[PDB]
Structure formats: C-alpha cells, structure tokens
Amino acid sequence: MSNPPTPLLADYEWSGYLTGIGRAFDDGVKDLNKQLQDAQANLTKNPSDPTALANYQMIMSEYNLYRNAQSSAVKSMKDIDSSILEHHHHHH
C-alpha cells in the first residue's frame, strides 16, 4: 500500500494457459490459488482498482503465508509422521 508505484502493464493475460495444468500438481493449495486467481480477475476487470488490489494483496498475504506454512510442514514431514499437527493458523 504505502510503497512507491511499480509497472503493471502485463501483470496477467495468458498465464491461465499453464496455471490450468500447474494447479493439478498443487491440489492442497489449489483452494487458495483459486481464491487468489478470483482476486486477480476482479483485478483483471480493473488492474489497479484499489479494492480489487487490496483484495488481491490481502488474499496474496494469506496465499504466501499458507504456502510458507506448507513448506514448513514438508521440511518437518519425518517428525509429523510421529507427532501429527495441522499447520493451519491465524495467531503466530
């Protein structure tokens, strides 16, 4: 938000051509990836509409955090196999 502006001329147009198949090797995050692509489509309708962009930035904050928590689970999978604990959270 408060940061300087940056280029946005080609932020999305054709990436669906490979996201359409990439999502199927990502099925445990495809859920939030769909929510973020829906943000990116409310954004596609107006690329710098500030609620669309606030929405995309908010869903992207959740997307990136949940992907980091999924990578933390993968880094710990040998321990989770004996000490099972879901990594879904809000407080940190």
TrEMBL record:
One Pfam family of this chain: T3SS_needle_F
Family statement: Belongs to the SctF family.
Protein name in UniProt: Type III secretion system protein
GO cellular component, as recorded: cell surface; extracellular region; type III protein secretion system complex
InterPro entries per the UniProt record, alphabetical: T3SS_needle-like, T3SS_needle-like_sf, T3SS_needle_YscF
Domain of life: Bacteria
SUPFAM superfamilies (alphabetical): MxiH-like
GO biological process, one term: protein secretion by the type III secretion system
Record localization: Cell surface; Secreted
Predominant location category: other
Protein keywords: Protein transport, Secreted, Transport, Virulence
